[PDB]
Amino acid sequence: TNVQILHGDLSPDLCDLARASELVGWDIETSGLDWRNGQIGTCQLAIGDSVAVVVLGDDDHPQGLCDLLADDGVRKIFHHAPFDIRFMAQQWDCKPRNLACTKIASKVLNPSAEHATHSLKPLLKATLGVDIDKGQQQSSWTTGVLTAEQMSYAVSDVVYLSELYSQLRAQCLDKGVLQAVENAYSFLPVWVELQRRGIEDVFAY
Amino acid sequence: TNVQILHGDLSPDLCDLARASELVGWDIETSGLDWRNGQIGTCQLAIGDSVAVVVLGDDDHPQGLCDLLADDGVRKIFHHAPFDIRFMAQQWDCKPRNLACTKIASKVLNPSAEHATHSLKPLLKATLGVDIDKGQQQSSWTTGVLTAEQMSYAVSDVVYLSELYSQLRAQCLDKGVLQAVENAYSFLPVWVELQRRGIEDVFAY
């Protein structure tokens, strides 16, 4: 894994590589859970054998990252895409396209499992035998400065997503639920627009 | 409008006509809002120029209606499909396919409107200039007996759905949101399976 640290936006070279990539792993770190009035601190992208950690500041509107997020020709893989894409769509006024989610896949595969088993850490252990440390999850991500410990945590949160997705995708195919999962993925851009306009669940009364 | 009253299941002639129809309007009446342990009292279907009201009894498992609901080659139009398909999927152990919803279309078109405007009665008035009377909505639908007033209400709840859908579909095309609406429709079979297995919102944490 080739780790790069950036600020303000993704580099043009990595934007180009992302457009040619099969899959782009994506995660964010934030001020908290407040997608409306909070702040994105980092974007971490896994592009090929590279992981890029982009440190963001107050009122950053990264054009390269938003163009990538909005590009329907680039497949983005998240763990719990709803959280990340809602934060980015609202904070950047960005329309995300071509989105996939390992947590949604886990839930469609095993809907009656205990809720905790769908979290990234247990899911990585159960699916790939990979152990990650979530200790820095609740650190302060929005100061424009990263510690080495934060960098390690940020890389670990994104670097396994493409492999996790590929394994979960295979499990969905084996069970005959991949089309169902893909129908959930195709609704994600609609879901987040509804969120921004105040419809919290279009399927509720 | 040619109205027919049936019991137990849809007639074979109407099942055949439904398979050749562009659209099939569908509504149900029930014991209440309890889709898990309640009871379906009627199914009302709009097939061509016909409306069929099928009166159902305790523990009815209508094979013809479930086959139609599960047939991906038959386009069903509901108003608030989530309510109806969840009731039918749970009560009949049926897998619904190829579903559309005038309420979801209304919400994607006008997500910031007052919630009441998405109800069938105001939506029919605003879109088609049609007035319906909802007085019999909260009657007792599960006794195996229908009054003439209940029959009139049941017909009115389904007979305008194909026209309402066509008008809303045109509005979605004009605004450029039809693909978004169709992505919501394609998630409905996944949504209801998740509901039955206890995932109330796969997009929540």
Residue numbers in the entry:
A (entry chain A), B (entry chain A): 2 to 206
What does the paper say about this structure?
Dinucleases of the DEDD superfamily, such as oligoribonuclease, Rexo2 and nanoRNase C, catalyze the essential final step of RNA degradation, the conversion of di- to mononucleotides. The active sites of these enzymes are optimized for substrates that are two nucleotides long, and do not discriminate between RNA and DNA. The active sites invariably consist of (i) a catalytic DEDDh/y-containing core for divalent cation coordination and catalysis, (ii) a leucine residue that wedges between the two bases of the substrates and (iii) a 5′-phosphate cap that coordinates the 5′ phosphate of the dinucleotides. Here, we identified a novel DEDD subfamily, members of which function as dedicated deoxydinucleases (diDNases) that specifically hydrolyze single-stranded DNA dinucleotides in a sequence-independent manner.
To understand the molecular basis for the specificity of dimeric NrnC homologs toward DNA substrates, we determined a set of crystal structures of diDNases: (i) a complex of diDNaseNoc with dpGG to 1.55 Å and (ii) diDNase from Rhodococcus (diDNaseRho) in its apo state (1.72 Å resolution) and in complex with dpGG (2 Å resolution). In both structures, the 5′ phosphate of dpGG forms a set of salt bridges and hydrogen bonds with the side chains of conserved residues K104, H80 and Y206, the latter of which is contributed by the second protomer, and the main-chain nitrogen of L121 (per diDNaseNoc residue numbering). The side chain of Y206 also forms a π–π stacking interaction with the 5′ base of dpGG. In diDNaseNoc-dpGG, the side chain of the conserved residue Ser120 engages in another hydrogen bond with the 5′ phosphate, whereas in diDNaseRho-dpGG, it points away from the phosphate. Additionally, L34 splays the two bases of the substrate apart in the same manner as leucine wedges in dinucleases NrnC and Orn. In the diDNaseNoc-dpGG structure, the C-terminus of protomer B is pushed deeper into the active site of protomer A than that observed in the NrnCBh-pGG structure, creating relatively less space for the 5′ end of the substrate. In NrnCBh-pGG, the side chain of residue H205 forms a moderately strong hydrogen bond with a distance of 2.9 Å with the ether oxygen of the 5′ ribose, while in diDNaseNoc-dpGG the side chain of Y206 repulses the ether oxygen of 5′ deoxyribose, pushing the entire nucleotide away. Coordination of the ether oxygen in diDNaseNoc-dpGG is restored by the side chain of residue H81, which donates a hydrogen from the other side of the substrate. The third discriminatory feature is the apparent restricted movement of the side chain of F84 in diDNaseNoc, which engages in a perpendicular T-shaped stacking with the benzene ring of F88. However, mutating F88 to an isoleucine residue alone or in combination with H81F/Y206H in diDNaseNoc resulted in significant loss of DNase activity without an increase in activity on diribonucleotides.
